Amino acid sequence: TQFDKQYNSIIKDIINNGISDEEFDVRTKWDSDGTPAHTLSVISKQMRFDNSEVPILTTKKVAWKTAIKELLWIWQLKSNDVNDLNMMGVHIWDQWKQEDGTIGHAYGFQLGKKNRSLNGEKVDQVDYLLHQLKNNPSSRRHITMLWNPDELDAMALTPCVYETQWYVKHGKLHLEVRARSNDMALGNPFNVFQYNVLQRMIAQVTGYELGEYIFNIGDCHVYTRHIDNLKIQMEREQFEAPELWINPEVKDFYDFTIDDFKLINYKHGDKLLFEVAV
Amino acid sequence: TQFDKQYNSIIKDIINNGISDEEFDVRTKWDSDGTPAHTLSVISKQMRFDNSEVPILTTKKVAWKTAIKELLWIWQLKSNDVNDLNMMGVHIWDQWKQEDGTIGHAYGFQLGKKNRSLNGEKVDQVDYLLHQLKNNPSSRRHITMLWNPDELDAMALTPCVYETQWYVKHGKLHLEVRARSNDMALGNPFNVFQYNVLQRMIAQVTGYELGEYIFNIGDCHVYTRHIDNLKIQMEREQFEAPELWINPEVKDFYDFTIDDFKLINYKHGDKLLFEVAV
């Protein structure tokens, strides 16, 4: 399957055929020097996997544990409170916390709203999805959406991976996800691994085998100063994918904890430091 | 960039590798005899066009005028009233008409909700998008969304082609659209033409040239009794694409009317009758 091979192909396309945003007055700067941080981009890319391997990069280490913590905060706890994430030892969302400690009506807040009728009760997007995957498998509407048009102005940030659609065919659960934009050096490897974990989780609790995993990206971009590191990274040895052990005893989506996941035999290349933009 | 070529490739893939829904207790049946109407399907397909020609089939006639009428009702009038569509002489939505004459809070209703703050006024998704394409071209969030999670239960039908993402690069306006599901025989040709017309309208009024046009589909299906006719279509002669004249004098999106569009030199194959699935 291999994520290293697909990722390298998309990166080489951006480097070779990407379009620069030098024409625009960009709002991002390099923190080492205050100069404008420009990117090269391409539109509409897709990565697809058969699930014979965990989609994880071996040419650099992906921060797999943090990826799963963030997934749990959004999908399982359905929280918009950065303090819950701090308690899991995660600090990457601190910059976005509002005066009240939350990120607004974004991400987990959207997955927690009880806005769907089911069995005469009001349930959220997640519980609705869980029920429908088991009881109405052939549905052409198994979708979750974080891009709520009525609440965009109340979000501290708008989500990048904002939707999923699921399909059940012949006992297999297929997942397709979309990101409206992705920084290919820093965000993409993290997001691709993270949603595959979500697919393995839900398939386990709904009773299905793993189908295909498809990850779509609208604006694929890489910052110009990251290009040197990406070129090094593309010449590195690629290892065999590691195994992801997920505790077999978990039967309920809300019972999973960070200790129920383990990556076995994860070999990867040395650390590359990427200049910060923001 | 014949759409005929790309369409025929997808259809062949479905006929050959498609998966049957015979395993499920389908709720659709054939009009002629009441038996269950099953389908073959494939997941996640994509068509891309460079806009050098109008994406329209020539192996059968597409209902181009009706497609533009429904587009204006949803995007320009932003109406959920079937009576408005009947006045333009269109009846394909009558079956979904609720007792108040509307389709609930779907389609046009979502595009007309004043939910975004802009310059001291509350504006809807379409005016917000028009403003942003001109004033914040480089945005990674030029998205419209009809899949509003808070209102799915208030919709008489959930939309098939439910989202768009727009990109502005080097003076060109690219459009990416997604359908969660598409009946490939009856719905896809109509939907693919209809959204390209929207691209041309919007580019004309915002002052950009035409970029790429991408159409993504999640569950791609064809009803089994439609197969023979599709096999016929595939062996038919293909003609050059017609030119689409759009009135050069319209400067405001809200000024376009049906008489501002004319297809010229549209040659296509003879009529094929497809069995109705209720």
Q: What are phi and psi of B274, to 5 degrees?
A: -105, 125
CA A22 from centre of chain = 28
Question: Rounded distance, CA A17 to CA B24, Å?
Answer: 45
Out of A47, A54, A57, A160, the active site residue is A160
Listed residue (A251, A226, A220, A255) closest to A42, CA to CA: A220
Torsion angle defined by CA atoms of residues B147, B148, B152 and B157, in that order, rounded to the nearest 10 degrees: -40
Nearest CB neighbour to A149, from listed B41, B145, B216: B145
Classified as helix, coil or strand, B164 is strand
Question: Rounded distance, CA A262 to CA A255, Å?
Answer: 16
Instruction: Centre a 10 Å sphere on the Cβ of residue B165 and count the other Cβ atoms it contains.
Output: 24
Handedness of CA A44, A49, A54, A60 (dihedral sign): negative
The technique by which this structure was obtained is X-ray
CA angle centred on B70, ends B64 and B73, rounded to 5°:
145
* Mutation choice for A interface testing from B78, B115, B126, B138 by most A CBs within 10 A: B138
Question: Rounded distance, CA A108 to CA A270, Å?
Answer: 34
C-beta separation of A69 from A198 below 8 A: no
* Domain count within chain A: 1
What domain range is B16 assigned to? Answer: 1-278
CA A127 from centre of chain = 20
Cα Dmax for chain B: 58
Classified as helix, coil or strand, B142 is coil
Is A179 labelled a binding residue? no
C-beta separation of B194 from B65 below 8 A: no
Nearest CB neighbour to B176, from listed A43, A148, A167: A43
Listed residue (B67, B83, B75) closest to B110, CA to CA: B75
DSSP string computed for A96-118: G--TTSB-BS-THHHHH---EEE
CA angle centred on B229, ends B228 and B230, rounded to 5°:
90
A61 conformational bin, left if phi > 0, alpha if psi -120 to 50, beta if neither: beta
Here the CATH number for the domain that contains residue A139 is: 3.30.572.10
Which residues contact residue B171 at a Cβ distance below 8 angstroms, ignoring those fewer than 6 apart? B208, B209
CA angle centred on B66, ends B32 and B85, rounded to 5°:
95
B160 is catalytic: yes
**Residues of B with Cβ-Cβ distance to A43 under 8 angstroms:** 167, 169, 174, 176, 212, 214
C-beta separation of A227 from A185 below 8 A: no
**Paired tokens of A60:** 């650099």
Question: Rounded distance, CA A16 to CA A37, Å?
Answer: 19
